[PDB]
Amino acid sequence: ETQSFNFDHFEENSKELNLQRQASIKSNGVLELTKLTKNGVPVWKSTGRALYAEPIKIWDSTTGNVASFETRFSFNITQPYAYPEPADGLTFFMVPPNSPQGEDGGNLGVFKPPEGDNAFAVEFDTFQNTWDPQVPHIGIDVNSIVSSKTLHFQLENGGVANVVIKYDSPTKILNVVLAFHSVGTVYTLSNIVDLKQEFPNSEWVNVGLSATTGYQKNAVETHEIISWSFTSSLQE
Amino acid sequence: ETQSFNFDHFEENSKELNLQRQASIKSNGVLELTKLTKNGVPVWKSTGRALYAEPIKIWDSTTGNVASFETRFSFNITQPYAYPEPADGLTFFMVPPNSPQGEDGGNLGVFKPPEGDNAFAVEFDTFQNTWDPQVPHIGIDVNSIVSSKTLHFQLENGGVANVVIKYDSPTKILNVVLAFHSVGTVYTLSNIVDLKQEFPNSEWVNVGLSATTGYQKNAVETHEIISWSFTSSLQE
Ligand SMILES: *[C@@H]1O[C@H](CO)[C@@H](O[C@@H]2O[C@H](CO)[C@@H](O)[C@H](O)[C@H]2NC(C)=O)[C@H](O)[C@H]1NC(C)=O
Ligand SMILES: *[C@@H]1O[C@H](CO)[C@@H](O[C@@H]2O[C@H](CO)[C@@H](O)[C@H](O)[C@H]2NC(C)=O)[C@H](O)[C@H]1NC(C)=O
Ligand SMILES: CO[C@H]1O[C@H](CO)[C@H](O)[C@H](O)[C@H]1O
Ligand SMILES: CO[C@H]1O[C@H](CO)[C@H](O)[C@H](O)[C@H]1O
Ligand SMILES: [Ca+2]
Ligand SMILES: [Ca+2]
Ligand SMILES: [Mn+2]
Ligand SMILES: [Mn+2]
């Protein structure tokens, strides 16, 4: 009925977090989603994803009940330069098991252009593509990079962000709270999302974090995750 | 289309804030909702309310649109003693114009027993009455002191709390974020509320803060508001 996991820090070679592409783990006990320099020389078009080994069940076929979950994590985004404009963003996401990876850059390594991929994600977009509003912003992506609801927030460069994503099965209310404590700012964005109806092909989904850097040179930024807890609660 | 007000501090004798009962304004530029001692001797059964002079419009009869508002405020609750247990709580609330005052203590000076008063309020209950869950908790009161949704939170004694109450007319999603920055804690509670259906007798409502202390000696705490901004935005 309940699935949980908590990372107060990130230990190297954990049998719990399954890393992909540029994503590695710093000796610091930090999860680094995208490299800023590989082999001494600066790079771009970097993409890093990190999933949780076990599939989380979001709804029951027999019972017909949808899970309620809450996940929290701290991240640190540093944007070194002012020109060219930094990119692309960081994002929490849920996809069905054994599902293709998303494109780089703008799609945050989660979504693909042809309407094929089935995914959900809460994004922290730092770059304004053709479909984006002023950046940076918080976005609720339901099967598309185009957020169904967004919120502009002022990023604290190199500061520690505290995120909370809470979803209540009964009210189908997805909520996102972004707060920068070291400065006293809080951002809250919430919209209605019908999980059962949006992931009808798998009662199970993989949960993970992802980030990506620009397509040009220097259109990059750091994407570090400091901690990350999760917990679903499926009744019935 | 838009009504706003902001108090980065509280000036004495402002023509924008109709104070009621025990509620006064300290010289430090703080709004003190309930006195802990009057003239030198300790007291209880204290009740303080503070409204905003102008009525805020929440919905339009003709167009049919409901307003969307967001209000933030910082408060400081200090509970001096451990026995007897402290009471009662602090709360943001909306009532129709020219409406009666609620009862002391448990009703937070907002609601009355006989189902007569029409009101809404986000409460920060510090005392567990017969209808309450473990305290302290955040509660969403829709026409009753019995919250339709609640959330237990650990209070930081004498610390500054940052509250955010955001309501989105289109999704009818009421959200409450309570965060104690000095410690790194965030609490988020959200439930669905149909403002237009819950205040059908007045397109207008008075907005205000309120607090109350126990019914017994020493079952008291301080209720200070440091800042408080609001903003509705009714389309059409
Ligand atoms: C946020 O991320 C930046 C980038 O990783 C951190 O800055 C780096 O600090 C390390 C020391 O641990 C240096 O070796 C790097 O050269 C720094 N990078 C840059 C671009 O300056 C920063 O320390 C992080 N902030 C926190 C609080 O963890
Ligand atoms: C909350 O308000 C209370 C009441 O003013 C503050 O507590 C006082 O703290 C001062 C020290 O600055 C003492 O001199 C008083 O004796 C305290 N009063 C009581 C009743 O204990 C408290 O510091 C405020 N909290 C914050 C974060 O400012
Ligand atoms: C013009 O857009 C392209 O380059 C920027 C960097 O400048 C971002 O990487 C974006 O996602 C990509 O599509
Ligand atoms: C037994 O309850 C009564 O006393 C406590 C204090 O002990 C509170 O004031 C409460 O609101 C009131 O109804
Ligand atoms: Ca983007
Ligand atoms: Ca109570
Ligand atoms: Mn976006
Ligand atoms: Mn209560």
State whether A188 and B181 contact (CB < 8 Å).
Answer: no
State whether A190 and B192 contact (CB < 8 Å).
Answer: no
Assess whether the C-beta atom of B34 lies below 6 angstroms from ligand 2.
Answer: no
Both tokens assigned to B146:
């019995």
Taking alpha carbons only, the member of A160, A153, A137 closest to residue A89 is: A137
Query: Cα separation of A173 and A13, whole Å?
Result: 35
Assess whether the C-beta atom of B159 lies below 6 angstroms from ligand 2.
Answer: yes
CB atoms within 10 A of CB B113: 10
**H or E element in which residue A198 lies:** helix A195-198
**H or E element in which residue A96 lies:** none
Compute, in angstroms, the gap from residue B56 CA to the centroid of ligand 6.
27
Query: Cα separation of A148 and B136, whole Å?
Result: 35
Both tokens assigned to A225:
């995750």
Both tokens assigned to B79:
């509970």
Cα end-to-end span (Å), chain A: 8
Which of A83, A85, A129 gets mutated to test ligand 3 (max ligand atoms within 8 A of its CB)? A129
Q: For A32, which DSSP code? A: E
Nearest by CB: A179 against B175, B179, B191? B179
The reported resolution of this PDB entry, expressed in Å, is: 3.3
Domain boundaries, chain B: 1-236
With beta carbons under 8 A apart, name residues in chain B contacting A142.
none
With beta carbons under 8 A apart, name residues in chain A contacting B171.
190-192
Query: Cα separation of B167 and A127, whole Å?
Result: 28
- Please name the amino acid found at residue B215: Y
Cβ-contact A230, A163 below 8 angstroms: no
Assess whether the C-beta atom of B89 lies below 6 angstroms from ligand 4.
Answer: no
With beta carbons under 8 A apart, name residues in chain B contacting A162.
184, 186
Query: Cα separation of B131 and B210, whole Å?
Result: 20
- Please name the amino acid found at residue A54: E
Q: What CA–CA distances, in Å, run from A69 to A149, A162, B49, B74, B143?
A: 20, 17, 37, 28, 29
Q: What CA–CA distances, in Å, run from A102 to A38, A111, A143, A208?
A: 22, 4, 12, 13
Q: Under CATH, what is the fold of the domain B1-236?
A: Jelly Rolls (2.60.120)
Taking alpha carbons only, the member of B129, B154, B155, B134 closest to residue B144 is: B129
Which residue has the least CA distance to atom 8 on ligand 4? B214
Q: Across the strands, what pairs with B165?
A: B71, B176
The dihedral region occupied by A64, where left means phi > 0, alpha psi between -120 and 50, and beta the remainder, is left
State whether B171 and A188 contact (CB < 8 Å).
Answer: no
